Design a protein around this ligand. Structure first.
Ligand code: CLA
Ligand code: CLA
Ligand code: CLA
Ligand code: CLA
Ligand code: CLA
Ligand code: CLA
Ligand code: CLA
Ligand code: CLA
Ligand code: CLA
Ligand SMILES: CC1=C(/C=C/C(C)=C/C=C/C(C)=C\C=C\C=C(C)\C=C\C=C(C)\C=C\C2=C(C)CCCC2(C)C)C(C)(C)CCC1
Ligand code: SF4
Lengths: 107, 706, 139, 37, 29, 62, 161, 30, 80
């Protein structure tokens, strides 16, 4: 309740480190308004360590998508008729993306 | 194929709404009237001048009639230090009970304005004391306006229409005006000071009923012919003298006291008289003396473009010299009235100077002939024309990067809790000059801070007697005679220079590129003001000489604004005796945001609210009114013709297809405003908005706190 | 000759067409012979259908007739688009082609009007024509 | 790739990467430099 | 001021009131 | 006379490259006026590089 | 005492700003644990401020009535350290990159694709103009005295009249 | 008793005629 | 109507004629060689002043120039 969130501690140079003001606790930083602290609390993230892998998992999935942009254009790029298959696309994005992606978040 | 507009034959065949707009825009643009000749042009100008002359006289008559009838001058003369001058009554049927209750002010019972033009302080000094002396001037100007009107009509009749040669006799006009217009008028004004103004300031009434009887000096005109001019240096007024009455009054009519009257804090009447008498002599002598003269005489725009250039120069001077040298009793003390007169005249100065260069560009397109102007001074600026703009372009860039840079530097370090890291440059060259003028505050200790220098002593003919009064005033901080400066004054002065340099560049380039450039070599063939040259060659929007004047009007307002912004904020502390607030906050821009705009808008913005209203509701309404019309100008400047013309077509379709309305039709086909038209209309809203925002704020902020 | 009447296309619409400018003065009529039964974009909205024809369309501006037939040249190769201007409520019939052949093709017998025997760097200043009824680019 | 580093934006950012980082260290090292002694 | 001096002012304002009606016609003529 | 391969400077002041140098591809060898075709390294405001210039509008600095 | 300015050693409101900033940090320091990384950031923020005040106390600077140091430029050599030697330090390095662009472009414009080497700038010639930039105040004297710093006005594109 | 008639003549009655005269001057022909 | 002038610096490219959206211009035989052709303006009453024409001339300093003049129903592009 009382303690406001803060991330992005600022570096010790000219006085931009005065933005690291007293927020509460033994911590000083820029008061963040991104809501990630109230977002991650509902998700259950209780120690910094659990998050630590994630950014790694957000980095390696960034590499996997960047390779998939490579692979699905430099090596194996589909036909025009694969893109005009709208009903199989609508079925999968409804079922898999929004359906299972909320089913798995329900899990 | 309609009769309207008369002056433009081509417009008259236009069947659309553009006809009416442009018929107004080309009406008084005589140089493109149909079938016109040079002789008819000049005779028409002369008569047109009388109409303007009549209006100024009527305006001053309107400035006189309303004060005598509804003002409080007679009440004002008695104790000026607390009475608010009344402009005129408020007769607005939409007022309620509580709005009448708020504007029934300045000790009036019906609602009236509190005047801020300073006419009360000016008329007092001139010798007016009662409302009936006011009533005479308005009636007199009514005749003079009708006499100017009759004269304009007179010099248009066949038997009295001048020839062309009379209008083009340039040398005789200068001679006759510095003789008549300047010489005789300035000398006479010294006479009106000594025969009327001075007696009334000493408690002696002089009117039409007695002016031939009472002499201005006990035994005057016997020393006048015999050369004994020194008798008029008899006993001046003592420091204990009370202005307008005879407790401490002297008998002098010509003096050289210097400084300011200790009670009024303004110039001595006898001091004003000698100055005008002396200048008068200078003009009368010079007025008896009479290839470029063959060029400045055939172009009406060149003459006017110098006449505005003369008018623009002396309009700026009026603002600078009236705030530092107050010439009217108690005008230094009416701070709102000190504020309105400086701002008003400074904006006017900006328009004339911009206008001078505008009409200069018109001269270059319609009158500058390359073959009758060869190997002279004019065509030799056109020689190295690319050099002048290129260097002027650099200085603007130079000034801007560094002046903004110093302000932002200070702001950041101040934002970080470290005000000591700010860059504050002392205006040492300026602080030199005031010390050279005698201001011993900065202590540079040379030139009339030097007590022994030949300037202060004047061993030539023992002349220098302005010096005692002057030295007292230049060291006392109770006036605005060479105000104290610091880091804030340094930065703004270079900003103003930046403003003066960027504004001058565009106007000079606009005239110099009016006839042509590589992007448009034949620009002169299309006239001054034309839309553009199409999207070809990369795009040509804002390529006309008119557009250069147009962009510069934005820059002048910014420049004249920054001057008035500076003058206003500085004066707030001096009038409230706390110059320290300004001195430290003016060196960074957040200070101008926190201690100038936001701070001084507290009362203005509360002129009316959910709890009531006060006597600032007009100014509060006008402030919002100004913001709206300023913003309305952005609409015409950003959205252009095409969008609107296509939009209008759907409305035309809809009207013609709507029963019970189809039955009626427009006489002029609806069309969007033109490309040039929109720029002018947008700028006009912008500029009116610029001023009426500043006029509302300036007046209201000062009138509530004093 | 316009041979009015001629079959209009099978169109049915256009709020964006031919209001009370036309019936008082100056409306138009394009004519061609469309060599199909294709669909084509009009300038008002777009689709009507071209006939075998004798095709004819009554438009509002000469501007609108030209951008129709440029499409008939580009998208349908119909070279026979013959634009007009109507009788009494219009002014001059058969403006284009005024000389029997296409105006991008050169035809002798036309008159070089507006043809100027000088450069534009050799243009006079208006001071040599000042207070005079001569115009700065005339000849 | 090394010729791709010689094109205008990367050579205008990497040169801006260096001289700016010079001022970051030297304003931590030598703080608050108004005047030369 | 008075009440009567106001109307003497408004009576001598017709002397500008006819000439501007004539001069603007004359500037048009 | 200015040849082919002739690096000429424009005297016709209406040109964008007035007082600038470009080489002549050729002229027209006919009875037409304005024959000279000149190519420049700078391009004009419509980003082209040539015109049919004349020989009273060029010089032969070489 | 160039305009009534009193020096920062005997400026009383200038030494007041040092008693006003760390006290705001002391209010920030009384509430914390005095071994925490806030407090090692709170002992630093006093002392980085301190040596700035002991730089301008010792420089012989002229602080004002605000308590803040000002800058003087009429240039005397008592106050040369405010503007002159920090100013010509700009000027030397400005002509360095100025004689980079003055010297890079005359050779490369005599090439076939003279403009792609403004896009893909050659790392040979640029680092040469780093070396050629160091001789900037000396080299341009034999340029102008020979005349090859300017041109004649028959060579330069000039708007019509 | 003077402005209470005068201001609704100059502000209301006067533009009702001087724009009526300057409606029949803009939209008439010879 | 608008004024459309064609100068003798025309290189007979015919681009301008084919750029005009209202067919205001046409090519006519040049007599200085009887092989060149120059543009001509028989329908200046239809020029809207769009200046699409002037953009099509390739020559360094255009041979056809449009100076906008008195406006009419045709030149203002009104559908009404
Ligand atoms: C059911 C499994 C499934 C899932 C989970 C997805 C998920 C996705 N697809 Mg889809 N897609 C699918 C089946 C699926 N697709 C099938 C079977 C087809 C072919 C018919 C497509 C055709 C398709 C296209 C064309 C695109 C996607 C895109 C996407 C991404 C949307 C961006 C986002 O919100 O994250 C998302 C990852 C978009 C994308 O961003 O790809 C990288 C995209 O452009 N998909
Ligand atoms: C051009 C304006 C002007 C006019 C119309 C007058 C007119 C007059 N002056 Mg004035 N006077 C003037 C300028 C003028 N003066 C100036 C500039 C000064 C200051 C030097 C004076 C200082 C002055 C004095 C001291 C006296 C006059 C006097 C007079 C009156 C007698 C003169 C005479 O008949 O011989 C006459 C009404 C005499 C008088 O009796 O005043 C009513 C007189 O004693 N004048
Ligand atoms: C880098 C080569 C170069 C050189 C030697 C010059 C030289 C000049 N410029 Mg120009 N200019 C240039 C590029 C150059 N300019 C660039 C890139 C721009 C766009 C930002 C401009 C925009 C410009 C304007 C608006 C003006 C000048 C003016 C001037 C003259 C006065 C000096 C001055 O104050 O400059 C002005 C300095 C600036 C505008 C700021 C610096 C310009 C850029 C950012 C420098 C970038 C250098 C680059 C990173 C180096 C690449 C490295 C490589 C060569 C190895 C001088 C002849 C002025 C003039 O007309 O004087 C009579 C003037 O008003 N210049
Ligand atoms: C706060 C907004 C803003 C800022 C920072 C600028 C800044 C500038 N203007 Mg701009 N300008 C502005 C608003 C602004 N303008 C507006 C509202 C208009 C009216 C549309 C203009 C119209 C304008 C013109 C016509 C010119 C400038 C020029 C300049 C440059 C002057 C050189 C210098 O000071 O360094 C500078 C970059 C000048 C320039 O760049 O010359 C080389 C110049 O000629 N400005
Ligand atoms: C154009 C006007 C201008 C000028 C003359 C200055 C000048 C200065 N600034 Mg300021 N300031 C400016 C604009 C300006 N700034 C702008 C635009 C900002 C917003 C970014 C700031 C925000 C700011 C901050 C936050 C700070 C400064 C600081 C300084 C000082 C530099 C001390 C230093 O460590 O450099 C040392 C220089 C060198 C070691 C080498 C210089 C030569 C190299 C080779 C070239 C560098 C080019 C890059 C110097 C007095 C610093 C300071 O101490 O304030 C007093 C500082 O901390 N400024
Ligand atoms: C180049 C742009 C420029 C412009 C248009 C102005 C304009 C003005 N200055 Mg400013 N000033 C400038 C640059 C400029 N100054 C520079 C570079 C400095 C040194 C930092 C100052 C320091 C300064 C002070 C202390 C004062 C003014 C004042 C004024 C105003 C009155 C005139 C005067 O006293 O001139 C003085 C003349 C000059 C300063 C010379 C002209 C500027 C040259 C061209 C700059 C060249 C820079 C140079 C190469 C740097 C090398 C340094 C090295 C030699 C050590 C006037 C608005 C006075 C004022 O505010 O009055 C109310 C005032 O007291 N100026
Ligand atoms: C581009 C701007 C423009 C301008 C300046 C004009 C100008 C004109 N129009 Mg045109 N017109 C235009 C575009 C324009 N038109 C457009 C976009 C349309 C819709 C397609 C029309 C449709 C149209 C028709 C049908 C008619 C005109 C008419 C007129 C003429 C008379 C003014 C008028 O009737 O307004 C009328 C004013 C309004 C509609 C404003 C609403 C007024 C409301 C009700 C409040 C006012 C009441 C209040 C009590 C005021 C009393 C004041 C008094 C006490 C002092 C005038 C020349 C008349 C004309 O040409 O006569 C032959 C006419 O019959 N116009
Ligand atoms: C812009 C180019 C640049 C340059 C010339 C330097 C130069 C330096 N760095 Mg720095 N540094 C830089 C950018 C740069 N740095 C960047 C982008 C980062 C973030 C990755 C760092 C992070 C960094 C750390 C953590 C340290 C240095 C240190 C140093 C110094 C010792 C040399 C070394 O490599 O370690 C030297 C002055 C050392 C130092 O002396 O710090 C005070 C040191 O400990 N640097
Ligand atoms: C020329 C400047 C001028 C101005 C701006 C004003 C303004 C005003 N007068 Mg005043 N008035 C003036 C001169 C002026 N007057 C003069 C010279 C006289 C004596 C003839 C009067 C006699 C007078 C009376 C008796 C009353 C006013 C009133 C008013 C107020 C309401 C409007 C009205 O009823 O006017 C009426 C105006 C007249 C009866 C005479 C005006 C004669 C002037 C010279 C006309 C100027 C016209 C101007 C140039 C037109 C430009 C616009 C046009 C080209 C489109 C308003 C504040 C009323 C008031 O006081 O309300 C509180 C009121 O009762 N005026
Ligand atoms: C002393 C002093 C001062 C002053 C200064 C000044 C006043 C200056 C000015 C300046 C000047 C008065 C100079 C002259 C100049 C002129 C001209 C004429 C120029 C030109 C230039 C150039 C030519 C350049 C060149 C270059 C280079 C060098 C390099 C790069 C390239 C280039 C080319 C850019 C001050 C106060 C600040 C400070 C203290 C001291
Ligand atoms: S409409 Fe405006 S942007 Fe378009 S060509 Fe004309 S001036 Fe330029």
């Amino acid at each position: 309740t009382t303690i406001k969130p803060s991330a992005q501690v600022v570096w010790p140079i000219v006085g931009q480190e005065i933005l690291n003001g007293d927020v509460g606790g033994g911590f000083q930083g820029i008061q963040i308004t991104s809501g990630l602290f109230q977002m991650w609390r509902a998700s259950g993230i209780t120690t910094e360590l659990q998050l630590y892998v994630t950014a790694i998992g957000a980095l390696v999935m960034a590499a996997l998508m960047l390779f998939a942009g490579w692979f699905h254009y430099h090596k194996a790029a589909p036909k025009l008729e694969w893109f005009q298959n709208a009903e199989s696309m609508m079925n999968h994005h409804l079922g898999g993306l929004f359906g299972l992606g909320s089913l798995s978040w329900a899990g | 194929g309609t009769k309207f507009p008369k002056a433009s034959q081509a417009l008259a065949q236009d069947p659309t709404t553009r006809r009416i707009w442009y018929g107004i825009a080309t009406a008084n643009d005589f140089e493109t009237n149909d079938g016109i000749t040079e002789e008819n042009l000049y005779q028409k100008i002369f008569a047109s001048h009388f109409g303007h002359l009549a209006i100024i006289f009527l305006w001053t008559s309107g400035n006189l009639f309303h004060v005598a009838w509804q003002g409080n001058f007679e009440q004002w003369v008695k104790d000026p230090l607390n009475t608010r001058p009344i402009a005129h009554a408020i007769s607005d049927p939409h007022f309620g009970q509580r709005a009448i209750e708020a504007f029934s002010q300045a000790g009036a019972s019906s609602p009236v304005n509190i005047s801020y033009s300073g006419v009360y302080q000016w008329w007092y000094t001139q010798g007016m004391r009662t409302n009936e002396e006011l009533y005479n001037g308005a009636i007199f100007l009514l005749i003079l306006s009708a006499l100017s009107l009759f004269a304009g009509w007179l010099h248009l009749q066949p038997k009295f229409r001048p020839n062309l040669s009379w209008f083009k006799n340039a040398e005789s006009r200068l001679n006759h005006h510095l003789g008549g217009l300047f010489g005789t008028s300035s000398l006479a004004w010294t006479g009106h000071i000594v025969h009327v103004a001075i007696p009334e300031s000493r408690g002696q009434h002089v009117g039409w009923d007695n002016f031939l009887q009472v002499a201005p000096h006990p035994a005057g005109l016997q020393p006048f012919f015999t050369g004994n001019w020194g008798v008029y240096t008899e006993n001046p007024d003592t420091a204990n003298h009370v202005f307008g009455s005879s407790d401490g009054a002297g008998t002098a009519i010509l003096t050289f006291l210097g400084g300011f009257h200790p009670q009024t804090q303004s110039l001595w009447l006898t001091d004003i008289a000698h100055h005008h008498l002396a200048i008068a002599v200078l003009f009368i002598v010079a007025g008896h003396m009479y290839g470029l003269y063959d060029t400045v005489n055939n172009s009406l725009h060149f003459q006017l473009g110098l006449a505005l250039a003369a008018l623009g120069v002396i309009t700026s001077l009026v603002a600078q010299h009236m705030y530092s040298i107050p010439p009217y009793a108690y005008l230094a003390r009416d701070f709102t009235t000190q504020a309105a007169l400086y701002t008003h005249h400074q904006y006017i100065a900006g328009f004339l100077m911009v206008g001078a260069f505008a009409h200069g560009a018109i001269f270059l397109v319609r009158d500058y002939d390359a073959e009758q102007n060869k190997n002279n001074v004019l065509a030799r600026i056109i020689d190295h024309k690319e050099a002048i703009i290129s260097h002027l372009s650099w200085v603007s860039l130079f000034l801007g990067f560094h002046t903004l840079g110093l302000y932002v530097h200070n702001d950041v370090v101040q934002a970080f809790g470290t005000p000591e890291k700010q860059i504050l440059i002392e205006p040492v060259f300026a602080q030199w000059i005031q010390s050279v003028h005698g201001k011993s505050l900065y202590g540079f200790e040379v030139l009339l801070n030097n007590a022994d220098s030949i300037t202060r002593v004047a061993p030539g003919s023992a002349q220098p007697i302005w010096l005692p009064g002057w030295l007292d005033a230049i060291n006392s901080g109770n006036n605005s005679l060479f105000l104290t400066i610091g880091p804030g004054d340094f930065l703004v002065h270079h900003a103003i220079a930046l403003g003066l340099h960027t504004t001058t560049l565009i106007l000079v380039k606009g005239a110099l590129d009016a006839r042509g450039s590589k992007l448009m070599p034949d620009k002169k063939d299309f006239g001054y003001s034309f839309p553009c040259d199409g999207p070809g060659r990369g795009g040509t929007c804002d390529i006309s000489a008119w557009d250069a004047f147009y962009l510069a009007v934005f820059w002048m307002l910014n420049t004249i604004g920054w001057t008035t912004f500076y003058w206003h904020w500085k004066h707030l502390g001096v009038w409230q005796g706390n110059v320290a607030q300004f001195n430290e906050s003016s060196t960074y821009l957040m200070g101008w945001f926190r201690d100038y705009l936001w701070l001084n808008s507290s009362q203005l913005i509360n002129g009316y609210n959910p709890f009531g209203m006060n006597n600032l509701s007009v100014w509060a309404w006008m402030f919002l009114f100004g913001h709206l019309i300023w913003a309305t100008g952005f609409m015409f400047l950003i959205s252009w013709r095409g969008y609107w013309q296509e939009l209008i077509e759907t409305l035309v379709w809809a009207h013609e297809r709507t029963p019970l309305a189809n039955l009626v039709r427009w006489k002029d086909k609806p069309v969007a405003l033109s490309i040039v038209q929109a720029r002018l209309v947008g700028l006009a809203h912008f500029a009116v908005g610029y001023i009426v925002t500043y006029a509302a704020f300036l007046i209201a902020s000062t009138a509530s706190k004093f | 000759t316009l041979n009015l009447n001629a079959p209009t296309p099978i169109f049915g619409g256009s709020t964006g067409g031919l209001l009370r400018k036309a019936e008082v003065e100056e409306f138009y009529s394009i004519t061609w012979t469309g060599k199909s039964e294709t669909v084509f974009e009009l300038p008002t909205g777009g689709a009507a259908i071209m006939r075998a024809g004798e095709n004819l369309l009554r438009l509002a501006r000469k501007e609108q007739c030209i951008a129709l037939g440029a499409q008939l040249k580009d998208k349908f190769k119909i070279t026979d688009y013959k634009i007009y201007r109507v009788y009494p409520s219009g002014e001059v019939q058969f403006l284009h082609p005024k000389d029997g052949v296409f105006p991008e093709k050169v035809n002798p017998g036309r008159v070089a009007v507006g043809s100027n025997k000088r450069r534009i760097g050799q243009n006079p200043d208006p001071a040599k024509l000042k207070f005079k009824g001569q115009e700065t680019f005339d000849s | 790739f090394s010729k791709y580093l010689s094109t205008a934006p990367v050579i205008g950012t990497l040169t801006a990467f260096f001289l700016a980082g010079l001022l970051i260290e030297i304003n931590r090292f030598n703080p608050d430099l108004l005047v030369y002694p | 001021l008075a009440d009567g001096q106001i109307f003497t002012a408004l009576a001598v304002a017709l002397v500008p009131g006819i000439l501007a009606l004539r001069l603007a016609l004359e500037l048009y003529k | 006379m200015v040849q082919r391969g002739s690096k000429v400077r424009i005297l016709r002041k209406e040109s964008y490259w007035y007082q600038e140098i470009g080489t002549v591809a050729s002229i027209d060898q006919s009875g037409i006026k304005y024959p000279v075709i000149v190519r420049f390294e700078k391009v004009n405001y419509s980003n082209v590089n040539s015109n049919n210039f004349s020989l009273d509008e060029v010089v032969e600095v070489e | 005492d160039v305009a009534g300015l009193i020096p920062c050693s005997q400026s009383d409101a200038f030494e007041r700003r040092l008693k006003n900033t760390t006290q705001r940090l002391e209010n920030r320091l009384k509430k914390y644990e005095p071994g925490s990384a806030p407090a090692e950031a709170l002992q630093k923020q006093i002392d980085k401020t301190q040596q700035r005040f002991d730089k301008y106390r010792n420089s012989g600077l002229l602080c004002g009535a605000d308590g803040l140091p000002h800058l003087i430029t009429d240039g005397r050599w008592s106050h040369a350290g405010e503007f002159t030697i920090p100013g010509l330090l700009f000027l030397y390095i400005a002509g360095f990159i100025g004689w980079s662009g003055r010297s890079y472009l005359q050779a490369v414009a005599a090439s076939d694709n003279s403009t792609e080497k403004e896009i893909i700038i050659d790392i040979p010639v640029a680092l040469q103009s780093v070396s050629k930039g160091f001789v900037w105040p000396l080299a341009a004297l034999q340029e102008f005295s020979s005349g090859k710093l300017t041109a004649r006005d028959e060579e330069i594109t000039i708007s019509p009249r | 008793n003077l402005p209470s008639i005068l201001v609704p003549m100059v502000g209301i009655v006067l533009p009702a005629i001087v724009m009526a005269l300057l409606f029949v001057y803009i939209e008439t022909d010879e | 109507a608008h004024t459309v002038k064609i100068y003798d610096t025309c290189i007979g490219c015919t681009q301008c004629v084919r750029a005009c959206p209202t067919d205001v211009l046409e090519m006519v035989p040049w007599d200085g060689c009887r092989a060149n052709q120059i543009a001509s303006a028989p329908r200046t009453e239809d020029c809207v002043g769009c200046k699409r024409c002037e953009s099509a001339c390739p020559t360094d300093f255009l041979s056809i120039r449009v100076y906008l003049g008195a406006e009419t129903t045709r030149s203002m592009g009104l559908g009404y």
